Design an enzyme around this catalytic site. Structure first.
Site, mmCIF file in Angstrom:
data_model
loop_
_atom_site.group_PDB
_atom_site.id
_atom_site.type_symbol
_atom_site.label_atom_id
_atom_site.label_comp_id
_atom_site.label_asym_id
_atom_site.label_seq_id
_atom_site.Cartn_x
_atom_site.Cartn_y
_atom_site.Cartn_z
ATOM 1 N N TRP E 11 0.879 -1.168 0.000
ATOM 2 C CA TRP E 11 0.000 0.000 0.000
ATOM 3 C C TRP E 11 0.918 1.219 0.000
ATOM 4 O O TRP E 11 1.928 1.230 0.705
ATOM 5 C CB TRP E 11 -0.849 0.056 1.267
ATOM 6 C CG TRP E 11 -2.077 -0.781 1.254
ATOM 7 C CD1 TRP E 11 -2.148 -2.138 1.137
ATOM 8 C CD2 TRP E 11 -3.421 -0.319 1.405
ATOM 9 N NE1 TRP E 11 -3.455 -2.551 1.209
ATOM 10 C CE2 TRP E 11 -4.258 -1.453 1.373
ATOM 11 C CE3 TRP E 11 -4.000 0.947 1.569
ATOM 12 C CZ2 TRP E 11 -5.650 -1.361 1.497
ATOM 13 C CZ3 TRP E 11 -5.387 1.037 1.693
ATOM 14 C CH2 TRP E 11 -6.193 -0.111 1.656
ATOM 15 N N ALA E 45 0.339 -3.791 5.526
ATOM 16 C CA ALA E 45 1.017 -3.807 6.820
ATOM 17 C C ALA E 45 0.570 -4.967 7.706
ATOM 18 O O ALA E 45 1.362 -5.518 8.470
ATOM 19 C CB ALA E 45 0.787 -2.486 7.537
ATOM 20 N N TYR E 46 -0.698 -5.344 7.599
ATOM 21 C CA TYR E 46 -1.225 -6.429 8.414
ATOM 22 C C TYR E 46 -0.536 -7.740 8.077
ATOM 23 O O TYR E 46 -0.472 -8.651 8.899
ATOM 24 C CB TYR E 46 -2.723 -6.560 8.176
ATOM 25 C CG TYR E 46 -3.478 -7.237 9.276
ATOM 26 C CD1 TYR E 46 -3.425 -6.760 10.584
ATOM 27 C CD2 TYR E 46 -4.270 -8.345 9.006
ATOM 28 C CE1 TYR E 46 -4.144 -7.372 11.599
ATOM 29 C CE2 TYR E 46 -5.000 -8.972 10.012
ATOM 30 C CZ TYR E 46 -4.935 -8.486 11.307
ATOM 31 O OH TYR E 46 -5.656 -9.130 12.294
ATOM 32 N N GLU E 47 -0.018 -7.820 6.857
ATOM 33 C CA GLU E 47 0.673 -9.014 6.380
ATOM 34 C C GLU E 47 2.144 -9.099 6.801
ATOM 35 O O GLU E 47 2.813 -10.090 6.527
ATOM 36 C CB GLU E 47 0.585 -9.093 4.852
ATOM 37 C CG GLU E 47 -0.720 -9.644 4.312
ATOM 38 C CD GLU E 47 -1.912 -8.749 4.589
ATOM 39 O OE1 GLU E 47 -2.028 -7.686 3.937
ATOM 40 O OE2 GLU E 47 -2.727 -9.117 5.464
ATOM 41 N N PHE E 69 3.137 1.989 5.180
ATOM 42 C CA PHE E 69 2.583 3.305 5.408
ATOM 43 C C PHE E 69 1.121 3.042 5.716
ATOM 44 O O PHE E 69 0.332 2.751 4.817
ATOM 45 C CB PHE E 69 2.706 4.176 4.164
ATOM 46 C CG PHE E 69 2.603 5.647 4.441
ATOM 47 C CD1 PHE E 69 2.046 6.508 3.500
ATOM 48 C CD2 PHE E 69 3.100 6.181 5.621
ATOM 49 C CE1 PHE E 69 1.990 7.877 3.731
ATOM 50 C CE2 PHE E 69 3.053 7.546 5.864
ATOM 51 C CZ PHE E 69 2.498 8.397 4.919
ATOM 52 N N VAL E 70 0.768 3.109 6.993
ATOM 53 C CA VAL E 70 -0.605 2.870 7.412
ATOM 54 C C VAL E 70 -1.230 4.209 7.763
ATOM 55 O O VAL E 70 -1.037 4.744 8.850
ATOM 56 C CB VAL E 70 -0.645 1.911 8.614
ATOM 57 C CG1 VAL E 70 -2.069 1.705 9.092
ATOM 58 C CG2 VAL E 70 -0.027 0.590 8.209
ATOM 59 N N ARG E 77 -11.126 3.048 10.103
ATOM 60 C CA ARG E 77 -10.108 3.368 11.087
ATOM 61 C C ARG E 77 -8.878 2.491 10.834
ATOM 62 O O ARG E 77 -8.959 1.259 10.732
ATOM 63 C CB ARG E 77 -10.650 3.164 12.500
ATOM 64 C CG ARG E 77 -11.751 4.136 12.848
ATOM 65 C CD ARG E 77 -12.221 3.960 14.275
ATOM 66 N NE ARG E 77 -11.118 4.016 15.226
ATOM 67 C CZ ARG E 77 -11.268 3.941 16.544
ATOM 68 N NH1 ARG E 77 -12.477 3.812 17.065
ATOM 69 N NH2 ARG E 77 -10.211 3.979 17.344
ATOM 70 N N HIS E 116 0.992 16.398 0.636
ATOM 71 C CA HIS E 116 1.144 15.243 1.513
ATOM 72 C C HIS E 116 2.035 14.177 0.907
ATOM 73 O O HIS E 116 3.016 13.749 1.518
ATOM 74 C CB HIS E 116 -0.216 14.630 1.863
ATOM 75 C CG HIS E 116 -0.941 15.355 2.956
ATOM 76 N ND1 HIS E 116 -0.364 15.627 4.178
ATOM 77 C CD2 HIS E 116 -2.196 15.861 3.013
ATOM 78 C CE1 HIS E 116 -1.230 16.272 4.938
ATOM 79 N NE2 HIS E 116 -2.350 16.427 4.257
#
Ligand SMILES: O=c1[nH]c(NC[C@H](O)[C@H](O)[C@H](O)CO)c([N+](=O)[O-])c(=O)[nH]1
Ligand SMILES: O=c1[nH]c(NC[C@H](O)[C@H](O)[C@H](O)CO)c([N+](=O)[O-])c(=O)[nH]1
Ligand SMILES: O=c1[nH]c(NC[C@H](O)[C@H](O)[C@H](O)CO)c([N+](=O)[O-])c(=O)[nH]1
Ligand SMILES: O=c1[nH]c(NC[C@H](O)[C@H](O)[C@H](O)CO)c([N+](=O)[O-])c(=O)[nH]1
Ligand SMILES: O=c1[nH]c(NC[C@H](O)[C@H](O)[C@H](O)CO)c([N+](=O)[O-])c(=O)[nH]1
Ligand SMILES: O=c1[nH]c(NC[C@H](O)[C@H](O)[C@H](O)CO)c([N+](=O)[O-])c(=O)[nH]1
Ligand SMILES: O=c1[nH]c(NC[C@H](O)[C@H](O)[C@H](O)CO)c([N+](=O)[O-])c(=O)[nH]1
Ligand SMILES: O=c1[nH]c(NC[C@H](O)[C@H](O)[C@H](O)CO)c([N+](=O)[O-])c(=O)[nH]1
Ligand SMILES: O=c1[nH]c(NC[C@H](O)[C@H](O)[C@H](O)CO)c([N+](=O)[O-])c(=O)[nH]1
Ligand SMILES: O=c1[nH]c(NC[C@H](O)[C@H](O)[C@H](O)CO)c([N+](=O)[O-])c(=O)[nH]1
Lengths: 148, 148, 150, 147, 147, 148, 150, 148, 147, 147
Positions: E11, E45-47, E69-70, E77, E116
């Site tokens: 991501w 990121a969860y992985e 990058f979360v 959320r 950003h």
């Protein structure tokens, strides 16, 4: 009252963290006259403290371990995810290794890299260090009394 | 129903915390004619309660353990972290040790070190103590029941 | 199988409101299982005392599912979230290690100021949650019995 | 050619289903049926972790997907469960070492209004496809790594 | 000389990338290639956690780095995941006792805008350097307190 | 004590708001045997209440004006802004016109358009209406008193 | 001069707690001014009804100062801040335009869940605030009488 | 039902704002068949609406004025200070000029410049516009009936 | 050579005084006594706006300074008053057209602890000097502009 | 051709400056000097409102611009002032009916760091351009709806 303590200090905001270390070492010096050895260990950042404490803990060489770090909100990212990870990390390690891990991993409501700020904590950490000092002794001592 | 409870009190805000202990003990005394022995264990601060409770629990010497502390936001650093670590800590510990850990580790939305706040909690903790007493009794009682 | 037991662990804080979830929970099962499912009730001081009880009861192997019921509300004095979390996490953990389902009826309102409306509202609502719990219990205990464990 | 256990919570099924359908659709499309997806109904997001573990432990699946819509309904706080679940799945995959993908979304706002129900009924289809890929990818990676 | 497993979420890949590139670059300019960095792609990121556990188990790595990058995309959320991943890593490095450095950043804000994007695109470079030094410092420190 | 009150009701969430009106009117009716005439004035939404009240107040036709609305957070846009503008609006208006403007412009912490929420407020607004009734009576009464 | 009048406008919500501020306020003045300062009491439905009343009373010119007393608390149903603000701002405005001092005893707690402790706490505290109010009133009315208006 | 309306539209997020305008104009077209003229006025940003409405209002030429703008949190600065200033600004003007000023100055909880986001509001503003349309008529109409 | 009305709230006088003393000190220093500062005691920050207006309207002062420490004491919400005051002063200077400088500070945190009391007792001296300059400056500017 | 009064707070001057410089620059590259911009220094953002009222009254200006950087320094609350200044301006332009454009920015974060500083130092340039266009657009629009 003769045992070893592993003071693990993150290097982020070293000048502030250092104040806690110096103060910690000095207080113990003043209370145990060196009969309590404080071994200092550097670590990149706070996140690196849990594991380091786990390792240094299982060596059996220390009566207690201290985690010192300044985790702050630098205004770009969120510091709390780490803070939590670390404050919990230490708690977890000590619950595992059954070796006390005192926390001097402070996270201020505000710290904007300003003189006032930086001076306030540069000074406060000294206080905190003294607190850590006493806590360390008290805990190690009581655990001993407790021990069978 | 004659057993021992380990009362682990943090020393921060001792004057407040002591009120919970004194009350806790007095209630059990009254309710159990002294049958319940409550052994007091001092500790630096809340962060020190979990391990202490684990260590004390595993001795098997106690039917239930009580963690007592006033974890507050002192307006300088964040308190929620340790608060969490400890409340979770006690929970973790009791789940491992299979020994009831009652929580009198309180965190007020506001405690500003004023007569009002101090007077309030010094008084309230007494109530909480009484609560912890009845809780301890109840839980120790219920467990032994489902054991039979 | 349709026949099995459920250990309903209920905290005693706000017992008045918690009770409704229980009464409701039991009634629903009786109305569905027809007594086929037994619900044993265990009282506990507060929500914090649910995890361990659920664990101990889970390990007995006597229950197809455990149910934690409690009202963990902010009383305007201390922060309730700390415990709420420990409890919601605790049950999740106990069930995870004991491989025994633990359904949460440990509810935490945004607002509960012990006022007629609040009490009344939740006193009534818990009845609903209780029903939901019963259905969840049946659903999950069932779904697990049909799992190809290979 | 492997098995995937798709655990879907039933709260807001209308929306959860949407993510599951698109998942199934994508895998069917990308793997032409090669990868099988077994759907598992579950009362609520809280019931996912354990289910995930149980299924992962059957060794039958290459990966597991937890799908749920945990929203703040205005009465109780949803975050406690959401956490217990996002953490629970994460805990299970770290235990069973069976990748567990998360389609347990928590919207900033969801007020049971048409605009919202419609938005998410739509967005879950997107999430489901993301799951699909993430699934394929991670499973693939674990092999490339296992060799 | 040693190896470092660099698991990177995909991501906001272009941003995550800068972190990696910088990390690999810094290490070269510090180990002259002594420290070998192996990159592993993972969906989100969860992985990361499970991958870092798996890779850690191998023993082939002196340290593991998780980069992701979360951000708060404005719909769901992200803190639930952020927390899970951050804890996850910390948990894994605690079990496997293999250092797991975190480059799993979560900005207060990131609204997919030129400003950003360009900002973190560049800042992840900085963070990657920090991640480099930290790895060297930590891997060094551990081996030291070992001898 | 026979006078007229202007009841300005916003039309968003009419079903809820109407309950406050119906109640408001029924209370005055009961408490004043009909002496108090309550003229109803529909309005698009809360943001429209202030001016309407000013316009209506200045006619001098009313002893008191009531602003009734349910201003809620619909999960899409922020509601507090208008909420503020209106609550302040009414205050401003009454201070200028010297004419009592009672507020039944309510903003719940949570309203998610569910049976529960709707059922709750549909019922509660009735209470609020009754409250506004007694308030109107009381205020109109007190003013005239300090006038003499 | 030491002799003058104060219009004490008190909201009737939580009248029990508000009353304490009044009782206290009056007692303090009587204990200080010795009746020299008269405090006329005016009842008002809720805090929102204080601004205008204070304005009307201010314009009478009969008072050296006005006092708004009210407990604007979050009841766990609606947001109280909106009104609280309007009121705290309202009094500020009325006093600003009428050049008549308006002291705020319109208090808004972080937490007030109408529980024994809460009620008791504030019931007692308002007494303190009342005293403070009395002193503020005297202080300000005085300070203004010594101002070089040039 | 023949009068003029001054639609003041900020130019930030024009594509979204425009949707409200178009929709506003179209709805009125469909309800009044053009008997209600809608004069469009461009303005840099939201902050510029209050004064513009004040001016356009005092001209006496319009039965009502509409403020349309999308004030969002772009993630760098705080949008609320303006939002407030503007939502209040309009309220103030209309209370002064006694000319209705409808608000289509929306501020979403979240808007991150993403397709989903941008498409959602591009579409919603149409809805909002229709609402503004009806509100405008309703208010103008009722004020008329009210008028003596 | 002009007059300045310094309104000081008495809540937290120990701290408020500190800002006022440094103000007086600075002006005395920078204007060698030229600029006179008249101190006005006031119960609380809420009492400042009106006082400010009254004094400004005497035409005696070139500028007015509102000094108060409005803090969150843990019991009631301070922000309501703080607002009414920061706005009130701002409203008065816009009315009377007499510049009103604000030394009505509201700390993020102030818990009546030594660390805090000490910090602000110290910081108010700094703020007071800032007031001094701001005062001189603004008054000066208004003239440069009036000519 | 017309004149624009540009009142600039002096706090974080170097950043505020970029806003001004850019504003003046843009106008030149758009009015070729037709529009004259007069700069007025004021202590802090709180000092803008009255100045803009005063300058507005003169009639010498087609529009007024307020530029300031009101950030959260981490000690006190800035929103009270921010609000007062923002409202203040809006209020003044409403009384004087002289456009008052706002360049009184308040960042979510600004912790006096290289990254933070350098970012707004550059972004205020952008904002200044926007302020330029807005002024031209608004001053143009007003005169139009006037003729
Ligand atoms: O000790 C700290 N470490 C920090 N770094 C986090 C972590 O300790 C490691 O250095 C790095 O993340 C990779 O493990 C901090 N911030 O990022 O803000 C901080 O404030 N304090
Ligand atoms: O018991 C407490 N300990 C506290 N200290 C934390 C911890 O208990 C130890 O004293 C020390 O951190 C080293 O472990 C507290 N705060 O910091 O705020 C508190 O409120 N209560
Ligand atoms: O069941 C509850 N227990 C509560 N007490 C916490 C805990 O359950 C135990 O009673 C006690 O803490 C000793 O462990 C609560 N609050 O404190 O608010 C609550 O809302 N609900
Ligand atoms: O999947 C969900 N389950 C929910 N129920 C919680 C949980 O999943 C179980 O159904 C039950 O709590 C006990 O097992 C939800 N809410 O309550 O809001 C939700 O949003 N999403
Ligand atoms: O790496 C990221 N993954 C994200 N997805 C979560 C997770 O990493 C997996 O991709 C997927 O959930 C299945 O496990 C993110 N968000 O959802 O916002 C994000 O910001 N960053
Ligand atoms: O009466 C209401 N009007 C609302 N609309 C705002 C305003 O009242 C007008 O309808 C419209 O804004 C044009 O002035 C609401 N929301 O937007 O949420 C609300 O909750 N209640
Ligand atoms: O005096 C109060 N009035 C309240 N009502 C608001 C207002 O004062 C009037 O009673 C009524 O709104 C009609 O104007 C309150 N709450 O609603 O919470 C409160 O706490 N205190
Ligand atoms: O209409 C808007 N104007 C905005 N600009 C503010 C103001 O309307 C003027 O354009 C400018 O500030 C000078 O007056 C916005 N933001 O800054 O974010 C926004 O979101 N929406
Ligand atoms: O100057 C202050 N006055 C305070 N009192 C409020 C007000 O100034 C008046 O004394 C009184 O409210 C009515 O005139 C404060 N608090 O209450 O917290 C404070 O922090 N600072
Ligand atoms: O322009 C600014 N002025 C500030 N000072 C406030 C005010 O502008 C005046 O300088 C002073 O208060 C006397 O009126 C600020 N802060 O305090 O943070 C700020 O960020 N920016």
């Amino acid at each position: 009252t003769s045992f070893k303590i592993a003071f693990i200090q993150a290097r982020w905001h070293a000048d502030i963290v250092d104040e806690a270390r110096k103060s910690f070492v000095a207080e113990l010096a003043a209370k145990t006259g060196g009969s309590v050895e404080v071994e200092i260990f550097d670590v990149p950042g706070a996140y690196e403290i849990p594991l380091h404490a786990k390792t240094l803990a299982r060596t059996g060489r220390y009566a207690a371990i201290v985690g010192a770090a300044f985790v702050i909100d630098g205004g770009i990212y969120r510091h709390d995810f780490v803070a939590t990870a670390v404050i919990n990390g230490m708690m977890q390690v000590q619950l595992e290794t059954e070796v006390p891990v005192l926390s001097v991993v402070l996270t201020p409501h505000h710290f904007h890299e300003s003189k006032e700020h930086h001076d306030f904590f540069h000074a406060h950490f000294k206080v905190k260090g003294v607190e850590a000092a006493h806590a360390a002794l008290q805990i190690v001592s009581e655990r001993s009394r407790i021990a069978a």
